[PDB]
Amino acid sequence: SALPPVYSFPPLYTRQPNSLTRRQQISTWIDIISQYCKTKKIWYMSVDGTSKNLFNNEDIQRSVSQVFIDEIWSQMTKEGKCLPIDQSGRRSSNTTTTRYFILWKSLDSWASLILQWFEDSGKLNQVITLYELSEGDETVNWEFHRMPESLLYYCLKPLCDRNRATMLKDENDKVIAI
Amino acid sequence: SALPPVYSFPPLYTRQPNSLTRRQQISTWIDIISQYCKTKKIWYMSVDGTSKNLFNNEDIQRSVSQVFIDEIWSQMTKEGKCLPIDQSGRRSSNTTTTRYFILWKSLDSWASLILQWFEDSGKLNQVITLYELSEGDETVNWEFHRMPESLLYYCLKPLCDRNRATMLKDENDKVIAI
Amino acid sequence: LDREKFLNKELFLDEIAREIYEFTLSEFKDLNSDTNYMIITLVDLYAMYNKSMRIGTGLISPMEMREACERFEHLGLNELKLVKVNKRILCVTSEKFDVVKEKLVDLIGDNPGSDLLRLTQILSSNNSKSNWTLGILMEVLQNCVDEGDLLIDKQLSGIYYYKNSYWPS
Amino acid sequence: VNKTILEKQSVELRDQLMVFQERLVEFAKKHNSELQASPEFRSKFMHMCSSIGIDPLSLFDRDKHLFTVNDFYYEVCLKVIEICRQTKDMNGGVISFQELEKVHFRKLNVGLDDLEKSIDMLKSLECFEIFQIRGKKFLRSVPNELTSDQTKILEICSILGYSSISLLKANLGWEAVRSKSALDEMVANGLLWIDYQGGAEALYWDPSWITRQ
Numbered sequence: 063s064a065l066p067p068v069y070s071f072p073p074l075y076t077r078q079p080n081s082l083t084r085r086q087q088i089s090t091w092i093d094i095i096s097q098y099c100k101t102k103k104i105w106y107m108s109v110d111g112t113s114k115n116l117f118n119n120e121d122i123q124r125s126v127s128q129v130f131i132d133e134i135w136s137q138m139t140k141e142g143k144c145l146p147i148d149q150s151g152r153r154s155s156n157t158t159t160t161r162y163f164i165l166w167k168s169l170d171s172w173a174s175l176i177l178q179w180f181e182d183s184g185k186l187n188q189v190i191t192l193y194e195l196s197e198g199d200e201t202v203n204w205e206f207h208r209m210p211e212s213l214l215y216y217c218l219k220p221l222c223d224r225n226r227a228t229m230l231k232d233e234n235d236k237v238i239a240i
Numbered sequence: 241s242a243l244p245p246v247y248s249f250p251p252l253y254t255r256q257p258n259s260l261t262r263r264q265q266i267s268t269w270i271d272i273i274s275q276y277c278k279t280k281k282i283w284y285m286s287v288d289g290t291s292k293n294l295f296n297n298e299d300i301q302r303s304v305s306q307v308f309i310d311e312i313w314s315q316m317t318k319e320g321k322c323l324p325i326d327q328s329g330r331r332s333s334n335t336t337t338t339r340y341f342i343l344w345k346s347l348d349s350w351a352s353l354i355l356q357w358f359e360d361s362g363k364l365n366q367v368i369t370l371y372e373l374s375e376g377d378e379t380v381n382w383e384f385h386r387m388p389e390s391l392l393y394y395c396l397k398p399l400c401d402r403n404r405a406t407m408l409k410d411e412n413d414k415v416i417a418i
Numbered sequence: 419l420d421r422e423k424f425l426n427k428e429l430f431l432d433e434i435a436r437e438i439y440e441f442t443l444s445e446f447k448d449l450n451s452d453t454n455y456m457i458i459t460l461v462d463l464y465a466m467y468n469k470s471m472r473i474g475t476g477l478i479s480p481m482e483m484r485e486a487c488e489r490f491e492h493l494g495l496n497e498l499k500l501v502k503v504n505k506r507i508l509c510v511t512s513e514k515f516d517v518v519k520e521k522l523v524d525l526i527g528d529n530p531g532s533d534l535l536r537l538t539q540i541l542s543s544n545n546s547k548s549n550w551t552l553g554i555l556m557e558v559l560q561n562c563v564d565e566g567d568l569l570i571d572k573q574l575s576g577i578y579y580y581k582n583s584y585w586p587s
Numbered sequence: 588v589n590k591t592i593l594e595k596q597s598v599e600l601r602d603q604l605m606v607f608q609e610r611l612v613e614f615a616k617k618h619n620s621e622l623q624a625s626p627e628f629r630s631k632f633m634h635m636c637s638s639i640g641i642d643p644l645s646l647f648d649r650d651k652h653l654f655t656v657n658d659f660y661y662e663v664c665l666k667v668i669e670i671c672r673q674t675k676d677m678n679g680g681v682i683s684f685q686e687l688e689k690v691h692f693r694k695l696n697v698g699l700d701d702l703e704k705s706i707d708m709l710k711s712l713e714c715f716e717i718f719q720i721r722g723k724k725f726l727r728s729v730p731n732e733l734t735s736d737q738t739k740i741l742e743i744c745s746i747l748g749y750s751s752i753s754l755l756k757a758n759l760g761w762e763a764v765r766s767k768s769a770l771d772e773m774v775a776n777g778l779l780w781i782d783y784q785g786g787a788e789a790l791y792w793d794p795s796w797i798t799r800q
Contacts, residue, residue, distance in 0.1 A: 067797055067798065068797055071780070071792070071794075071796070071797045072748075072749075072782050072784065072785065072790065072792065073780035073781060073782035073790070073792045074780075075782075075784055076781070076782050076783050076784050078780060078781060079574045079575060079774060079781055080574070080575065080576055080774055080775065080777045080780075080781075081533060081534075081535065081575050081576035082534065082535065082576060082675075082676045082777055083676055083677075083777045083780065085676060086676040086677045087780075090677070124784040124785065125784075246584065249580075249584075250531070250571040250578065250580070251569035251570060251571040251578075251580045253571070254570055254571050254572040254573075255572075256566070256569055256570060256582075256585070257563065257564070257570065258563070258564060258565070258566025258587075259566075260566055260585075260587055261566040261569070261582060261585040261587070263585075264584075264585035264586075265584075265585050268584075268585075302573065305768060306764050306768065307764065307765060307768050422654065423651065459714070460712050460713065460714065461668060461709075461712040461714040462668075464665075464668065464712060465665050465668045465669060468661075468665060469665065477658055477661050477662065478661060479644075479657065479660070479661045479664070479708060479711075480661075480664060480708050480709055480711040480712045481708070481711040483711075483712070484711050484712065484713075502713070506730060508712070508713040508714065552672075553672075556729070556730065557730055560730045560731070572772065572775050573775060574771055574774055574775050574781075575775070576775060576777070577775060577776075
């Protein structure tokens with residue numbers, strides 16, 4: 063669970079003055095984030111946390127300095143495990159960074175499961191929407207279920223190297239074919 | 241000239257741990273105490289430090305450690321160059337050890353360079369007090385000038401063993417019969 | 419290509435010694451130009467030796483590794499030796515201990531004000547001829563320091579390194 | 588007139604043991620797996636060999652098939668060699684046997700006694716060292732001895748997990764300079780984690796306070 067023990071080791075919550083530890087501190091943090099969003103099937107997350115904070119819903123002790131969360135956040139993305147968003151999967155970093163998409167699995171990977179949705183079945187010729195391979199009745203042991211359209215796109219897009227599959231845009235939406 | 245350069249060397253402020261280096265360092269951390277007071281004309285130094293600090297003060301980087309100081313101090317003690325006090329020379333490791341009177345020349349290299357005040361002045365017999373030989377019209381091209389009385393008491397306490405020229409006590413303070 | 423299924427013990431060693439000596443050499447001299455070396459802490463040239471060249475061949479115990487490694491000399495394997503350094507450093511190396519300490523100092527010297535991590539980067543992420551692997555790096559750093567060959571600058575941050583060019587022994 | 592009435596018992600005694608062993612090898616020779624996938628059985632099968640005085644790890648030799656009880660022993664050695672490294676920073680080059688036991692070693696089911704020997708095994712690589720804080724064994728990845736002091740701080744941490752500037756004066760009569768001073772090196776050396784969120788006084792922690800299990 064989002065109960066990794068250390069999650070309550072007081073010092074975690076304060077940037078360590080020790081270089082090699084400072085490091086571990088972060089990486090550990092990154093590691094926590096991750097598994098909470100997995101297990102408790104979370105998707106996106108702020109700089110607060112999704113109600114409750116990962117950086118302080120541990121108010122039942124203390125909480126991480128924002129200045130840090132940031133530094134963490136970064137190195138959490140530079141590593142490519144968290145994704146910066148706002149309302150649309152992109153950056154510029156301000157009016158364009160508030161929530162974050164989180165990757166249990168990679169991207170160029172996370173499609174290979176969507177795709178292998180179709181592969182494992184065959185309905186690949188077909189055309190279906192995002193609000194479908196999601197929220198509908200294709201919520202089997204495909205941990206991409208309930209996943210948000212707005213991100214969903216992001217994962218499909220890799221389902222197109224030079225050798226693709228393809229979307230059904232709109233100057234207002236999207237949905238796909240394989 | 242109180243900025244030798246070593247004084248700007250980070251590893252000077254950490255208690256190097258190699259016995260034989262621990263020292264040699266120390267010694268240098270000394271000829272900084274020493275000459276600093278000299279060319280910059282100071283007399284007594286604290287531990288904390290004289291607001292300026294030969295140690296902590298080191299502000300464009302970061303400071304020494306008390307334990308080291310104290311250690312630094314002691315080995316200067318023994319080699320005889322600094323001396324402990326609260327207001328009063330003699331000691332008692334706590335209260336009566338809390339200020340050090342540096343020491344360009346020895347303690348008595350100090351006494352003797354006073355009877356030299358009497359070698360080219362023709363004032364060998366009189367009876368002068370400290371407020372004298374130190375301040376006023378005694379801030380001659382003779383360096384013990386401005387030298388606070390208390391150490392004087394001490395620079396002079398040895399003369400009382402050679403020519404044997406005593407001093408004038410009132411409640412046990414001073415002025416002397418050279 | 420044989421499993422730990424020989425019969426007269428001090429062979430498997432003799433031999434096992436041989437296998438290692440190669441696993442080790444197979445990890446550096448390759449370079450066109452020869453000036454490189456590999457100093458290496460036993461314990462590591464151990465999870466390396468096994469995890470690598472010996473998961474199926476027959477995994478071995480430490481005592482063995484040691485026993486083995488201690489043989490090189492005798493077997494006319496003269497490109498590496500095992501050696502206690504000070505009385506704490508245990509390693510098989512390719513040069514005199516000192517002449518490696520030297521190369522460190524000297525380099526630390528060049529980039530002074532060094533963090534382990536940095537000392538690492540110079541020594542590892544710049545590919546160029548290094549077999550420095552953490553531990554033995556780590557271990558040697560501590561000699562210099564004790565031997566007083568290096569001046570420490572211990573900060574709450576971590577320990578920064580410099581060349582004891584001032585208080586010589 | 589007494590000298591041989593015992594020098595005699597020797598020769599057969601030798602047997603009795605030479606027996607008990609070629610014996611021991613079989614009780615083992617049989618449980619080729621009751622030994623390979625089961626701690627408790629491991630331990631018991633040794634606390635015997637030791638009494639008699641026979642290194643188990645060796646019994647596991649007279650017949651090829653016993654050579655995997657050792658593999659496991661060796662195997663676990665490497666895990667230790669590794670868990671130690673993969674941790675050098677979280678902790679400091681010092682580790683609670685607990686953690687080793689009740690944390691990193693569930694993945695392969697090995698147990699205190701097991702681990703323990705493995706660690707002894709290693710003494711051959713001549714690299715780790717064991718030390719105990721209040722009767723809790725720790726293994727030390729790094730080169731430096733914790734101090735004669737540092738121990739204490741570490742020792743005096745066992746209570747609630749965090750020696751402090753006061754907690755030290757107070758509970759130990761440890762001065763107060765010869766405290767922060769001594770406490771911070773413990774952070775530069777990265778053995779305990781600092782913590783500003785909890786009072787005017789800074790709190791210093793034990794990575795291990797964490798695995799109290």
